[PDB]
Structure formats: C-alpha cells, structure tokens
Design a protein around this ligand. Structure first.
Ligand code: H6A
Ligand code: MN
Length: 294
C-alpha cells in the first residue's frame, strides 16, 4: 500500500550556551542520537549565516537520476536549475511548489522508485566541490571579502569549513555542495572510515532523511544483500553503495530500526559513525556537508 513514514529522529534546539561549540554538544547528545543514527540540530533563531557562494559564476552539470533504474533490470546556473526544478515540481503535482505536502512527495518518491509503468527522471547537482565557487559559509579566504556582520559566521565552530577533519594516525578534506530538486536522492551508505558527517541546508525546500543506528548496521547490510539484484550482491561495499536503493519500510519489515526527518533551511543534520543514511530532496534547495573527526 502507501508508504508508512518511519518515526521522527531527535531534534535538538540548543541554547546559546549549548551552541558554543559543536563537538562538545554532539558529545553530550550522543547517548540518544547514536541510538537513532541521525539527528537534527536547530541553531538559535538569530543564528543566520549569509550565503557566500559566487552566485553569478555558479555553473554545473548535474547528474541524471532515474528513480526506478533497479526495478527496470545540460549545464545550469543556480538560477536556471531553480527554474527547471520549480517547473518540474509544479507541473508534476499540478500545484505551487510550496503547497505540496512533504508527506505526498515522500509517498510519491517511494512509489516511483518501485514503479515499472512510470519512468521519472530528475537531475541532482551533487558532489560540487566548495573549492570551485566557494563555500556557502563565509570564509576568511581572501578570494571574497567578508562584511563585519559576516565575520562571526566565518569564525563560527558550526561553519563547516571550521570542523576538525584530521584523524590521529601513526603517520605523524573540504565541504561538498548539493543543489537539489524534487525527487533527487542519495542512496543508503555510510561514510568512509565510519566517520561522522554534518550537513547544513543553506536555503530551499526541505531535504528528507532516513537514518539507521550503528548497532543495526550489520542487520541492514544483511537485508540489503539478501534483496539486492544477484548481479550486485557480490560487489564490494564501496561499489554496491552506489546503487543501494531500498524502501525504508522494507528495512522496517525486517526488524531494522529506521528514523526520518525533514531538514528545513537553516538546520543541521548530524550522522553518527557507521549510521547508514539515505534520503531525497523535496524541491529546489542547496546543502553543504563535510566529514569530521572527534
Ligand atoms: O545528497 C545529499 O544531500 C547527501 C546526504 C547525505 N550524504 C551524502 N553523501 N555523503 C557522502 C557521499 C559520498 O560522496 C561524497 C563525496 N564524493 C565522493 C566521490 C568523489 C566526489 C565526492 C557517496 C557517494 C555515492 C555513494 C555513497 C557515498 C554522499 C553522496 C554524494 C552524492 C550522491 C549520493 C550520496 C549526500
Ligand atoms: Mn553521507
């Protein structure tokens, strides 16, 4: 029948005192958040970083995504991609883009993923390096001067360019950008080296997430292998993770705990070590993400 939304993941609204530095805050919420895999963090109301990408020269060629590709077995500016994205969604649902309920897009997305009668194809501006046109956060680069009202965000610990990224090893990365449209998605995966990830939605329509706690990681991998196509079941995890598309209800039917959330503009999503996650975009939006170490 229809998609059954998983339970909501934890949402934290830290005070200005708790918001002082992310690593200590993430360490404190860990007893709860590591049991849900993902969590959402809403900064205080007055914490509003300005968007710092060079919008004039921002150009990219998004990847083509066919939603039902497993069942079946153009260069844009930010403005032109947004026009394409809004036109697609308003045409698909026959209503203004901001009036489409998040539950309907979610229900339609998972129906289209398993549909053999309807081939829906979207585009995703994914894995755009922040080195190309700058980070969405203000940065003391020198490649783009910052206003005085911007400096606190250039120095903030929640600025994804200021997250610790070095892992201590016996030898003695930068954020990535995602320009989304309706139904553009990221399949089930964990980060390299089981690292944390922090994700910030700069603006636009919500990004819908699904997360699995790390204690159920082997359960998910067993379900994924049992139900993956026979040609992909034997592939190494790093390659299989390119096509690990699975309805959350299938995992839940196999006893795997799954949590969801709608990440709205200005909110963070943190994924914990070895927490499998997947999701899709409700519409035209802009996200920034990085892996970090504790
Ligand atoms: O869309 C998002 O909002 C999102 C949300 C959560 N997580 C990710 N992550 N997180 C790590 C990766 C990862 O790529 C990121 C770095 N990327 C690696 C190759 C060279 C270029 C840079 C990835 C990609 C495919 C499968 C599994 C993980 C990805 C990713 C990237 C592109 C498509 C699908 C997933 C994205
Ligand atoms: Mn990820």
């Amino acid at each position: 029948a229809e998609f059954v939304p998983p339970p909501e993941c934890p949402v934290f609204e830290p005070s200005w005192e708790e918001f002082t530095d992310p690593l200590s805050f993430i360490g404190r919420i860990r007893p709860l958040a590591e049991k849900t895999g993902i969590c959402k963090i809403r900064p205080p109301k007055d914490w509003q970083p300005p968007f710092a990408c060079e919008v004039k020269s921002f150009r990219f060629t998004p990847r083509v995504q066919r939603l039902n590709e497993l069942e079946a077995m153009r260069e844009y500016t930010l403005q032109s991609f947004g026009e394409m994205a809004d036109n697609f969604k308003s045409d698909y649902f026959n209503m203004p883009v901001h009036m489409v309920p998040t539950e309907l897009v979610e229900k339609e997305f998972w129906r289209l993923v398993s549909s053999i009668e309807e081939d829906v194809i979207v585009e995703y501006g994914a894995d755009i390096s922040s080195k190309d046109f700058g980070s969405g956060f203000p940065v003391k680069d020198g490649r783009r001067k910052i206003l005085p009202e911007e400096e606190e965000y250039a120095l903030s610990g929640w600025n994804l360019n200021n997250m610790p990224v070095l892992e201590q090893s016996v030898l003695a990365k930068v954020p990535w950008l995602y320009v989304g449209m309706c139904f553009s998605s990221f399949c089930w995966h964990i980060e390299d080296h089981w690292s944390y990830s922090i994700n910030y939605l700069h603006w636009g329509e919500p990004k819908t997430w699904y997360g699995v706690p790390s204690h159920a990681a082997e359960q998910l991998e067993e379900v994924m292998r049992e139900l993956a196509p026979e040609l992909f079941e034997s592939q190494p995890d790093l390659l299989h993770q390119l096509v690990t598309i699975m309805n959350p209800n299938v995992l839940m039917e196999h006893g795997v705990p799954v949590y969801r959330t709608n990440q709205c503009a200005g909110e963070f999503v943190v994924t914990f070590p070895r927490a499998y996650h997947s999701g899709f975009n409700q519409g035209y939006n802009f996200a920034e993400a990085v892996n970090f170490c504790t």
